[PDB]
């Protein structure tokens with residue numbers, strides 16, 4: 001079939017030091033895809049390993065001399081970041097459904113021995129049905145290989161979302177770090193604000209949290225049931241921090257809140 005290999009770049013989805021991301025529309029089928037135009041070898045290698053409904057799908061890559069093209073799943077709903085209203089958050093049933101999907105994606109990645117290392121609402125994309133997709137494996141790494149866990153030591157991520165062990169310990173387990181950033185994402189969805197610039201005792205907001213001063217912002221805005229979950233996630237000792245199997249047993253995680261996607265209906 002002629003011209004099915006041709007794509008038109010119609011809008012900028014992102015741009016930075018790495019290069020740029022464009023929305024590409026197939027000339028024949030009008031299929032929409034995200035094309036990342038560029039560390040990069042590792043991103044492609046990690047992406048070739050991934051196949052999950054809550055992970056941005058990788059379709060392939062092509063090299064045109066010095067330029068690398070990564071063909072990725074286009075998520076028309078944009079970034080979770082833009083669903084968070086500043087200092088408000090979003091309705092608790094929406095945040096619960098996004099959090100369930102985030103956990104499904106993170107369980108999958110950890111099950112194949114991959115850690116994302118930069119979980120934040122900018123890297124959580126939404127498709128046409130508001131299904132969450134974990135995006136950008138540029139900072140990701142393999143933490144388990146041949147059933148042997150390797151401890152990490154590299155400073156990676158974004159300070160408001162990083163686990164305190166990354167700033168205090170030479171080595172750390174990969175999985176509690178991603179669990180911690182998911183708790184920060186949950187805090188942002190429910191309060192529309194980040195609790196601290198970084199998780200250090202020098203940060204007053206962080207010291208206040210360890211002193212259980214939940215009568216303060218952002219905690220005062222969060223209902224007692226999701227707040228009890230955050231108390232288990234945002235635990236300084238990564239060995240005492242709740243694991244994802246235990247997050248799935250949490251009371252708020254399993255609380256019925258949200259009705260399914262509205263279906264057309266008539267009466268009489």
Ligand SMILES: COc1cc(-c2ccc3c(c2)Nc2c(cccc2OCCN2CCOCC2)NC3=O)ccc1[N+](=O)[O-]
Pocket residue numbers: 013014015016018021034036073074075076077078079125135136137138
């Ligand atoms: C894989 O790595 C990346 C991927 C993207 C990306 C890819 C696809 C979409 C997307 C972003 N976001 C997106 C979509 C649809 C509409 C808008 C979108 O982005 C919002 C634009 N932001 C930047 C400009 O200012 C507003 C917020 N859906 C999308 O599917 C952006 C940056 C990187 N990166 O390397 O830093």
